[PDB]
């Protein structure tokens, strides 16, 4: 029908579809082959079978469209896109392209794009690329975040405030709510601000901790897991990254929330040809270039990553990568095993995270406000500053909390 | 008569049955040559065979229904599988396969599966692949685990929960006890949980070492032994992980306790092909991490949970790297300390590092509180130190006897 409802229907469901289209040995293939039976003996109307995807250009210079849903796996249901195609319309990897597709003529492998319906949500005639828009602080537009789930959103806003085009390092050691702190800045970003594309990239991980995202947030999850190779992991991420610049390109605001940079980082290393601990000097680079990518852009738009930074994990190779990231970012929220191990549960180093340019993300008044705060909280230890913060904000919400605590 | 009850006879039973058939100088063969030679000399009373084994379709489309019994060592009594009866029937490696047998005919090599009667304990003509269930997180389900057997068993259940579908490491030093601790979780297993499939699989073992786990586990017990080829290793292994994904397509709980992912993992080390990180190829780790990223509890029911060794402190720096690329894939993690160890404390827990992910789902809310309220006392406490506390005050009695035993 169209391939990318189709690609969204549970397996089951496209199972009993293609048995009623006449389909026989289908419960035994994997979802994008049953994808592609249904969609190859659906090869009987005449200008009905819609396709889309994320362009990816190989070497060779023709392209692929690729599914979010599939987190980009090469798959048997790719849409072919020609390199006559992607001269005709200017198209450079990332650019999402959506429009009619075709089956095979035989000795073709895949369905292919008939016709260019658009680009990037816009006319496929029509953009000045990431790489020359201009970078500023970024920090101006603040990305703002009743319950007790609000609680941490509540400590972010104080502790280390988030703006359209952040570049925000996490730093987490295990077992400290790394994962459930990034579900929560999801769902914030999602109920708050839902004019931003948001994009939650996982790198090195569990299968069925990629589902309980996957089920969380209102965006794109893209994932690899641990049982893939480097080769994927990078792949992912660039094929993430790409679609994000040119989203930027058409003046949007998009946020990417990256679990592992240090992960990632992990993958480059092992993928590029030929040390510090373990890591090649060189390999670095690409992660780096991909952090470095974080902008609030001049010309409109902002780019916005958020990536945890792996610590304490007894590798060195972990180790060297977080040396490597300090001084990359411009938010830091700094997670303490002391806080987790005593399960107060927002667990943000207090004094250990903030934002650069706050000034730019905050009303004077508010600052001030913030000022005081951290007046008071600086000489506290770690775990008494967060048990401080919750017994004094669950009486609240953020902005009473100051009125109230004054007199 | 049926191939598994033939391949199930002590191999002295084999030749007086033999022998007493009319067969000559078959004494020093090896017991699936004579086995061979009591199906084909047993071809007399024709439509009586029976045969069965795991499949595995080789590269050219026809397969093989190895047997278990040999740790799915290719031999001379290994049921040849049509490629036309694979296709007939949707077959895939790693599927059980039941049936009647026939002898080679002039110019074969193998008996033959020439009626097909159960596929995965099914209807043959009767499921939707592993790869494609989703997959929770593995804790809408426990498997808990007064004698002092029940001292490991009981330990284990309050470090670290094992529930329907966990992928757990067992990071384990020399002489720890990890070897009787894999016999306590099996024992634990098929007297507490019957109900789920126990597949035991043990790579790179010394030949006794094999034997003693083949008789106390009740359950499925395939190794591979030093003296065979890393190929060999590999090989056993995908066969155990293939059938494994199989059941579990049938919505049961298969459990794989698998000793030395190390191990599994030089093997495809030796094994892969060509960018080195400290003697092992980059490359190489993927299907080890694959075997063990396998491990899930799925949504349309069934499960399946993998508990692997890591070994550890073997002075060998491509172990440890191993250990290393496998620091964070798992959901539970159990570690013994050589420290407990020398000191003869048995159960030698390291309680403060073992535990497990989503403890609140495998968990009544009163359970865990009581186990929160344990960890709090045990924290501040050494790793020696934490064991004999813990022994001594499960030497009263059992379980919930600890806790409204402790609340004085
Ligand atoms: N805000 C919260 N409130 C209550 N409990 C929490 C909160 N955040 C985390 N926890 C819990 O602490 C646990 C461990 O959290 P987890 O999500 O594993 O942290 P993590 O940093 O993702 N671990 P790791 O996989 O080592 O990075 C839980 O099981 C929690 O329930
Ligand atoms: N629960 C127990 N009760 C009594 N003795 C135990 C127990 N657990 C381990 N041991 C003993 O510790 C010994 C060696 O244990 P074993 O299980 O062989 O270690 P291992 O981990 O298999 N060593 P290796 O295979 O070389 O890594 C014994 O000989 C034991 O008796």
Same mark, same amino acid.
């Given at each position: 029908?169209?391939?990318?409802?189709?690609?969204?229907?549970?397996?089951?469901?496209?199972?009993?579809?293609?048995?009623?289209?006449?389909?026989?040995?289908?419960?035994?293939?994997?979802?994008?082959?049953?994808?592609?039976?249904? &969609?190859?003996?659906? %090869?009987? +109307?005449?200008?009905?079978?819609?396709? !889309?995807? #994320? $362009?990816?250009? /190989?070497?060779?210079?023709?392209?692929?469209?690729?599914?979010?849903?599939?987190?980009?796996?090469?798959?048997?249901?790719?849409?072919?896109?020609?390199?006559?195609?992607?001269?005709?319309?200017?198209?450079?990897?990332?650019?999402?392209?959506?429009?009619?597709?075709?089956?095979?003529?035989?000795?073709?492998?895949?369905?292919?794009?008939?016709?260019?319906?658009?680009?990037?949500?816009?006319?496929?005639?029509?953009?000045?690329?990431?790489?020359?828009?201009?970078?500023?602080?970024?920090?101006?537009?603040?990305?703002?975040?009743?319950?007790?789930?609000?609680?941490?959103?509540?400590?972010?806003?104080?502790?280390?405030?988030?703006?359209?085009?952040?570049?925000?390092?996490?730093?987490?050691?295990?077992?400290?709510?790394?994962?459930?702190? &990034?579900?929560?800045? %999801?769902? +914030?970003?999602?109920?708050?601000?839902? !004019?931003? #594309? $948001?994009?939650? /990239?996982?790198?090195?991980?569990?299968?069925?901790?990629?589902?309980?995202?996957?089920?969380?947030?209102?965006?794109?999850?893209?994932?690899?897991?641990?049982?893939?190779?480097?080769?994927?992991?990078?792949?992912?991420?660039?094929?993430?990254?790409?679609?994000?610049?040119?989203?930027?390109?058409?003046?949007?605001?998009?946020?990417?929330?990256?679990?592992?940079?240090?992960?990632?980082?992990?993958?480059?290393?092992?993928?590029?040809?030929?040390?510090?601990?373990?890591?090649?000097?060189?390999?670095?680079?690409?992660?780096?270039?991909?952090?470095?990518?974080?902008?609030?852009?001049?010309?409109?738009?902002?780019?916005?990553?958020?990536?945890?930074?792996?610590?304490?994990?007894?590798?060195?190779?972990?180790?060297?990568?977080?040396?490597?990231?300090?001084?990359?970012?411009?938010?830091?929220?700094?997670?303490?095993?002391?806080?987790?191990?005593?399960?107060?549960?927002?667990?943000?180093?207090?004094?250990?995270?903030?934002?650069?340019?706050?000034?730019?993300?905050?009303?004077?008044?508010?600052?001030?406000?913030?000022?005081?705060?951290?007046?008071?909280?600086?000489?506290?230890?770690?775990?008494?500053?967060?048990?401080?913060?919750?017994?004094?904000?669950?009486?609240?919400?953020?902005?009473?909390?100051?009125?109230?605590?004054?007199?």
């Amino acid at each position: 029908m169209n391939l990318t409802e189709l690609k969204n229907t549970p397996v089951s469901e496209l199972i009993t579809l293609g048995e009623n289209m006449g389909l026989e040995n289908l419960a035994r293939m994997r979802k994008q082959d049953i994808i592609f039976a249904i &969609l190859k003996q659906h %090869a009987k +109307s005449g200008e009905d079978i819609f396709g !889309d995807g #994320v $362009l990816e250009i /190989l070497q060779d210079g023709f392209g692929f469209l690729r599914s979010a849903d599939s987190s980009y796996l090469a798959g048997p249901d790719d849409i072919y896109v020609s390199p006559s195609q992607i001269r005709r319309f200017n198209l450079r990897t990332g650019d999402t392209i959506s429009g009619k597709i075709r089956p095979p003529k035989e000795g073709e492998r895949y369905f292919a794009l008939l016709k260019v319906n658009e680009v990037n949500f816009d006319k496929p005639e029509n953009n000045k690329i990431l790489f020359e828009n201009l970078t500023p602080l970024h920090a101006n537009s603040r990305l703002r975040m009743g319950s007790t789930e609000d609680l941490t959103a509540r400590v972010l806003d104080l502790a280390s405030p988030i703006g359209r085009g952040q570049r925000g390092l996490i730093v987490a050691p295990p077992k400290a709510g790394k994962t459930m702190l &990034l579900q929560n800045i %999801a769902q +914030s970003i999602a109920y708050n601000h839902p !004019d931003c #594309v $948001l994009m939650v /990239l996982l790198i090195d991980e569990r299968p069925e901790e990629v589902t309980e995202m996957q089920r969380l947030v209102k965006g794109e999850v893209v994932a690899s897991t641990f049982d893939e190779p480097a080769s994927r992991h990078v792949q992912v991420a660039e094929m993430v990254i790409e679609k994000a610049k040119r989203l930027v390109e058409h003046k949007k605001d998009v946020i990417i929330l990256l679990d592992s940079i240090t992960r990632l980082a992990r993958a480059y290393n092992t993928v590029v040809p030929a040390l510090t601990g373990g890591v090649d000097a060189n390999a670095l680079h690409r992660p780096k270039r991909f952090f470095g990518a974080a902008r609030n852009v001049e010309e409109g738009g902002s780019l916005t990553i958020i990536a945890t930074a792996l610590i304490d994990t007894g590798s060195k190779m972990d180790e060297v990568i977080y040396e490597e990231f300090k001084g990359t970012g411009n938010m830091e929220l700094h997670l303490s095993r002391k806080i987790a191990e005593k399960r107060v549960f927002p667990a943000i180093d207090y004094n250990r995270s903030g934002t650069r340019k706050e000034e730019l993300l905050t009303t004077q008044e508010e600052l001030q406000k913030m000022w005081i705060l951290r007046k008071i909280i600086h000489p506290m230890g770690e775990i008494d500053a967060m048990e401080f913060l919750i017994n004094k904000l669950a009486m609240t919400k953020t902005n009473d909390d100051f009125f109230e605590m004054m007199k």
